Design a binder for this molecule. Structure first.
Ligand SMILES: Cc1cc2nc3c(=O)[nH]c(=O)nc-3n(C[C@H](O)[C@H](O)[C@H](O)COP(=O)(O)O)c2cc1C
Ligand code: SF4
Ligand code: SF4
Ligand code: SF4
Ligand code: FES
Ligand code: FES
Ligand SMILES: [Ca+2]
Lengths: 156, 905, 147
């Protein structure tokens, strides 16, 4: 079913050149596959294990340890809202309520069209500009519940 | 070192941590994540004690005793108040998510978590919230998975991955959702996965084969026995209930098989419970199989044997020393035959002569782990002697142990040792006809025919010592790899050469002997190990006798009219047609056996022998260690019609009824004394176990725990009157709970580990002098022979290079842990685990013959055309065909034989 | 840019010192910030921490001697080696030498970050730099150094 592409394999081997042990490239191999395909399927776990020379159990333990490596299918855009303490003081719950009202999903689910997936996340290191959100690669600060529909419709 | 625990002064080892030192002193500290064989990691935080800086310190500090060295002048407290509350809190934290599962849990009564919950005194629940749950996985036919009961102690992953070298088990997930298992559903691939049921302190991993016929540990009848499934001689505790064998537990032997079995020994006991087993003497008459009791069967056999002119005996390496000796006394030494083939016998005596005349010490199984370089020649040890492969893995990790010891890191801090020794390992060089399971840690693997492996061994011996014979025609690439092996072996302090008779080549054993001799001549501390085939192969070799071919010739010419076959199916060691013809020609065939075999159709008399569960005896190790196994249960206790005697009892009574026309059954010690009187080489089997008069302060050794239940109900459906307790005149054990099983009892044979407050396999701590060491009063079993003062000469018979001949296919043996052993492959749980019989082809040979993978090809061996599906084997050398030895229809005697007319079906 | 200018790579500044710098992007766990767990995650493993002793200075990343330091410590280093040790001791009359990035977050008037010497009063930061609390809000608690 799964097969690593030439670009994926080349990037994985190039990352393998940077370490004494080829096992050290497992996190970035999973991130490369996730960047190419949105998430990491099971055949990706076996293929990364075959390329790196480590067992699939170690690759799966790494993939399920780290929260930003997705082992379940996600939407086209991953909304990641900060639920930590400073954003709790700055009112992240209004932002979460606005997102749940706009998308009609619970945190951790994907919309019916596969466009957005909503996830709470730990502190984004932007606490002085809170509350904070992280869409696919863009960090949005100074969030208000009124600006959520404007911020969500620029991600088709 | 001097430690002060709770005001008392103790002398301990400074190289040990505090937990193992205090457990060796008899103090009770609760623990989960530490294991004596796995080291300390500090995960579960259960072993907390209060350490003080000096004698005049009142505050102290909570430390983990498994992670704290037992240094000199160390002040700790176990019964300190705060440490007790912390250990109870750790138990409570584990109990918050634990399912309400003890009545329907196979670990109940044998559970370390139950024992530690009771030991900390935690019995009141104040947690009121929900418990986390987990879905289970299918882990194959042997291990049942119940992830809800996990306490996240990481013992399974540490054992399976770091110790056993397995790759398909791991820890997944995160904070409180940690999941221990496989990445997907499937059978656990490790040959040592069965030890998880004792490694896991909870009921996550359970024995599925035991779970089919489950009973609790207190209801079991145990005996100390020896595993019969290969030659390694691992000590086991078979446990029965209601007349059937229900579990094989690991019995601790600090010299052999300390904590661990292989999956063959743990799960291949199911042939004992087969319903087609003979339970009575059966005599054929016309086409009627009449059932006799023991006395008239003995009388009829004695008169019929007396009417014959020559009686010959055919023993087996399955049978014990006493049974083979009783057969040899019944028929005479000149008429006794070993029952194995001529080439198999020649290889067995060569291995024995190397063992007790080569002048090189042969290590025990535990001692293998201390060798700094391993060369394995021809023996696929994972499929034939698996515990040796586990010990070789430990010996390979010895290099990381050495570099950690150079950095003043304690030997129990296993994570630091593994971090220092990342991938540096001791050299391992394995040679086989194909890839082995040891190739993941092997420094080099040599895939070649057995003559080429022997040539590699002789070249290694010649490069180590120029007095050894040379090999002509070595390619420069192979010469460079031989030089790599020689540089690795010469620089090693303790090289170990492992070989065996399973390769089917005499020259491989000769080459291994020459390598060992060349290393001995350089002053190295070289050890040699020989892997035999069956449980008492070495005892049959020591006793000696003619080969099976000579017995078949004697039957076929007509010089012998009576043949007595003891525990031998005769088809694994000879062609089926020759055996059938010789047994059909013979007017009297008597078969003394415990399994329904194909030669019982031509048998005039069948004597229902006992299996190892229902018999006593002695078996000789692959390292020459005599080990006594004891009867577990009386087979006539539930079924009174069952006449299932010991094989030596049958044969001694037969000899007595033949001589004096009267029946004297025997006692076991009489047969042992007869063995040590007539055979001086087997004189060490007297000291293997004490005789039947041995007592612990006047009382016998108990076979069942003190809380053994149902004593007035287990036979009540047959008769409301309780029967007589079975009497054991053979051994020092009693068939009851009225006996001794104290951990401080001065004995070496322990039927089962139990201590008050320790109901789990962790109860073996109380039975040892120090935890992870030896048994307190010595491990059972003695060595038959010591190291010879003088060695052998160099074997100058260097074999020629393998040349593929057209129309002839050399049979390369492919052994399997599940299937190649006879009795274990009769077990029903091994049928699913064993694979379909494939025939291995080189890609070039398959392309020449025009067959792809999975296509059935038919070949004629001994005038018999059989068909098998083709599996493509890349590593197999061309001109060879790969066959699975030990399966039905493919005898292990086929290893090294040729093969004609390989045609597509 | 530093590799192009010869400040990184082989034979830096003609000294003979070889040094290459890599950037290993994380995968989203807070425990990875712990130094032994950082070493474990750098080796491509699950980011469990390690027991000390042994310290990473003797056997750290891949069993080699290894030193793990914060970004701000390594950013403090070049000023020390460019201006002198006595300059670093003579910028604050406190037991902790040098400057430190200190800030106030929450519902304050000016949340942000400022480089201040050690021994600066927390009330001084909150009032002068953060501008105090916002209008209509009364201060009730504070955390000095994170969660
Ligand atoms: C749970 C935990 C999380 C930590 N996270 C970080 C972190 O994110 N960044 C950091 O620099 N240190 C973090 N640390 C501190 C490190 O263990 C270590 O002290 C530091 O990274 C390097 O030491 P230094 O301050 O001398 O440079 C964390 C410690 C713990 C216990
Ligand atoms: S694992 Fe032990 S404590 Fe848990 S349910 Fe089973 S017997 Fe009870
Ligand atoms: S499955 Fe068993 S051995 Fe493994 S961590 Fe859980 S309780 Fe420990
Ligand atoms: S290694 Fe051999 S003796 Fe030991 S448990 Fe396995 S089959 Fe039995
Ligand atoms: S608390 Fe939300 S960005 Fe830090
Ligand atoms: S036994 Fe010491 S922390 Fe687990
Ligand atoms: Ca008996």
């Amino acid at each position: 079913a799964f097969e690593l592409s030439a670009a994926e394999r080349e990037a994985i081997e190039h990352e393998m050149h940077h370490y004494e042990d080829p096992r050290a490239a497992s996190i970035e191999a999973l991130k490369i596959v996730q960047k190419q395909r949105g998430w990491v399927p099971d055949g990706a776990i076996h293929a990364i294990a075959d390329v790196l020379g480590i067992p699939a159990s170690d690759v799966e333990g790494v993939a399920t340890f780290y929260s930003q490596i997705f082992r379940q299918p996600v939407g086209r855009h991953v909304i990641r809202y900060c639920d930590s303490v400073v954003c709790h003081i700055n009112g992240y719950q209004g932002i979460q309520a606005a997102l749940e009202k706009k998308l009609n999903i619970k945190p951790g689910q994907t919309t019916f069209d596969g466009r957005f997936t909503l996830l709470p996340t730990c502190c984004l290191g932007n606490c002085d500009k809170g509350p904070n959100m992280m869409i696919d690669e863009d960090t949005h600060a100074h969030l208000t519940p009124e600006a959520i529909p404007e911020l969500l419709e620029r991600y088709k | 070192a001097t430690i002060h625990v709770d005001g008392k002064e103790y002398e301990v080892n400074g190289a040990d941590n505090l937990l193992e030192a205090c457990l060796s002193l008899g103090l009770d500290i609760p623990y989960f994540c530490w294991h004596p064989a796995l080291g300390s990691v500090g995960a579960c935080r259960q072993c907390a004690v209060k350490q003080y800086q000096n004698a005049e310190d009142t505050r102290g500090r909570l430390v983990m005793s498994c992670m704290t060295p037992a240094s000199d002048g160390t002040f700790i407290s176990i019964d300190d108040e705060e440490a007790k509350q912390f250990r109870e809190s750790v138990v409570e934290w584990l109990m918050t998510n634990h399912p309400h599962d003890c009545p329907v849990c196979e670990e109940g009564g044998n559970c370390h978590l139950q024992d530690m919950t009771v030991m900390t005194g935690h019995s009141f629940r104040r947690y009121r919230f929900t418990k986390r749950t987990h879905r289970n996985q299918d882990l194959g036919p042997f291990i049942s998975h119940e992830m809800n009961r996990c306490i996240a102690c990481y013992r399974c992953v540490r054992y399976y991955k770091d110790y056993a070298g397995g790759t398909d088990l791991g820890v997944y997930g995160a904070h409180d959702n940690v999941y221990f298992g496989r990445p997907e559903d499937g059978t656990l691939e490790s040959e040592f996965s069965g030890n998880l049921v004792e490694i896991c302190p909870t009921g996550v991993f359970t024995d599925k084969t035991h779970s089919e016929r489950y009973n609790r540990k207190w209801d079991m009848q145990f005996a100390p026995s020896i595993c019969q499934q290969c030659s390694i001689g691992c000590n086991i505790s078979p446990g029965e209930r209601y007349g059937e064998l229900r579990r094989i537990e690991n019995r601790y032997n600090g010299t052999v098989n300390h904590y661990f079995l292989c999956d063959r020994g743990r799960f291949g006991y199911g042939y004992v419970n087969l319903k087609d087993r003979p339970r009575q003497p059966v005599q054929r008459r016309g086409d009627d199989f009449i059932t006799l009791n023991a006395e008239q069967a003995m009388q009829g056999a004695a008169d019929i044997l007396r009417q014959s002119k020559k009686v010959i005996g055919i023993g087996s390496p399955r049978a014990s020393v006493e049974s083979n000796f009783a057969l040899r006394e019944l028929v005479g030494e000149e008429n006794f035959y070993t029952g194995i083939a001529h080439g198999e016998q020649e290889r067995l005596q060569l291995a024995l002569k190397v063992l007790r005349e080569g002048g090189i010490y042969t290590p025990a199984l535990r001692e293998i782990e201390s060798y700094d370089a391993v060369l394995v020649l021809g023996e696929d040890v994972t499929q034939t002697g698996a515990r040796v492969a586990l010990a070789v893995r430990q010996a390979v990790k010895g290099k990381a142990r050495e570099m950690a010891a150079a950095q003043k890191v304690a030997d129990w801090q296993i994570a630091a040792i593994l971090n220092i020794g990342q991938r540096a390992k001791h050299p391992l060089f394995v040679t086989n006809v194909d890839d082995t399971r040891l190739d993941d840690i092997a420094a080099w693997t040599y895939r070649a025919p057995v003559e080429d492996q022997a040539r590699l061994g002789f070249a290694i011996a010649h490069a180590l010592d120029n007095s050894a014979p040379a090999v002509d025609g070595i390619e420069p690439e192979l010469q460079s790899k031989i030089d790599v092996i020689v540089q690795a072996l010469a620089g090693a302090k303790k090289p170990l050469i492992i070989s065996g008779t399973n390769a089917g080549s005499l020259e491989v054993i000769q080459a291994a002997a020459n390598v060992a001799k060349a290393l001995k001549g350089r002053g190295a501390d070289v050890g040699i190990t020989m892997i035999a085939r069956s449980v008492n192969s070495m005892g049959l070799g020591i006793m000696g006798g003619g080969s099976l071919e000579e017995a078949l010739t004697e039957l076929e010419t007509g010089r012998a009219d009576a043949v007595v076959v003891l525990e031998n199916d005769l088809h694994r060691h000879a062609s089926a047609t020759r055996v059938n013809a010789a047994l059909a020609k013979a007017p009297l065939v008597m078969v003394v056996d415990h399994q329904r075999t194909a030669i019982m159709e031509n048998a005039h008399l069948v004597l229902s022998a006992a299996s190892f569960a229902e018999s006593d005896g002695t078996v000789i190790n692959n390292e020459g260690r005599a080990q006594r196994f004891f009867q577990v249960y009386d087979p006539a206790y539930y079924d009174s019609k069952t006449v299932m005697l010991e094989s030596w009892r049958w044969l001694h009574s037969l000899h007595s009824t033949l001589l004096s026309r009267e029946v004297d059954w025997t006692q076991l010690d009489h047969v042992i004394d007869a063995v040590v009187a007539k055979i001086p080489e087997l004189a060490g089997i007297k000291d293997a176990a004490p005789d039947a008069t041995f007592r612990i302060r006047g009382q016998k050794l108990a076979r069942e725990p003190h809380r053994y239940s149902g004593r007035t109900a287990m036979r009540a459906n047959i008769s409301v009157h309780e029967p007589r307790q079975p009497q054991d005149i053979d051994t020092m054990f009693t068939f009851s709970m009225e006996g001794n099983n104290q951990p401080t009892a001065h004995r070496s044979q322990v039927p089962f580990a139990w201590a008050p407050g320790w109901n789990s396999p962790q109860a073996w701590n109380k039975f040892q002098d120090e935890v992870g060491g030896k048994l307190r009063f010595g491990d059972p079993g003695v060595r038959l022979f010591e190291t010879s003062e003088n060695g052998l000469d160099y074997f100058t018979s260097v074999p020629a290079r393998f040349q593929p001949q057209d129309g002839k296919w050399r049979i390369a043996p492919y052994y399997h842990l599940f299937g190649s052993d006879e009795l274990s492959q009769r077990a029903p749980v091994f049928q699913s685990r064993m694979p379909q019989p494939y025939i291995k082809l080189n890609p070039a040979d398959a392309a020449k013959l025009g067959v792809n993978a999975g296509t059935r090809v038919s070949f004629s061996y001994d005038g018999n055309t059989v068909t098998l599906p083709v599996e493509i084997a890349e590593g197999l050398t061309a001109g060879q065909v790969g066959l699975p030895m030990g399966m039905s229809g493919i005898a292990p005697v086929l290893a090294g034989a040729h093969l004609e007319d390989l045609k597509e079906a | 840019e530093a590799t192009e200018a010869g400040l990184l790579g082989k034979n830096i500044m003609g000294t003979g010192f070889d040094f290459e710098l890599f950037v290993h992007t994380g995968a989203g766990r807070y425990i990875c910030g712990e130094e032994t767990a950082l070493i474990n995650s750098l080796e491509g493993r699950r980011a469990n921490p390690r027991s000390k002793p042994p310290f990473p200075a003797t056997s750290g990343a891949w069993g080699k001697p290894t030193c793990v330091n914060n970004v701000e410590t390594l950013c403090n280093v070049p000023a020390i080696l460019a201006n002198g040790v006595e300059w670093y001791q003579n910028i604050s009359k406190s037991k902790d030498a040098g400057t430190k990035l200190m800030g106030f977050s929450g519902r304050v008037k000016n949340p942000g970050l400022w480089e201040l010497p050690f021994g600066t009063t927390a009330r001084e930061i909150l009032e002068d730099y953060a501008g105090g609390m916002r209008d209509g809000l009364k201060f009730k608690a504070w955390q000095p150094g994170g969660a």
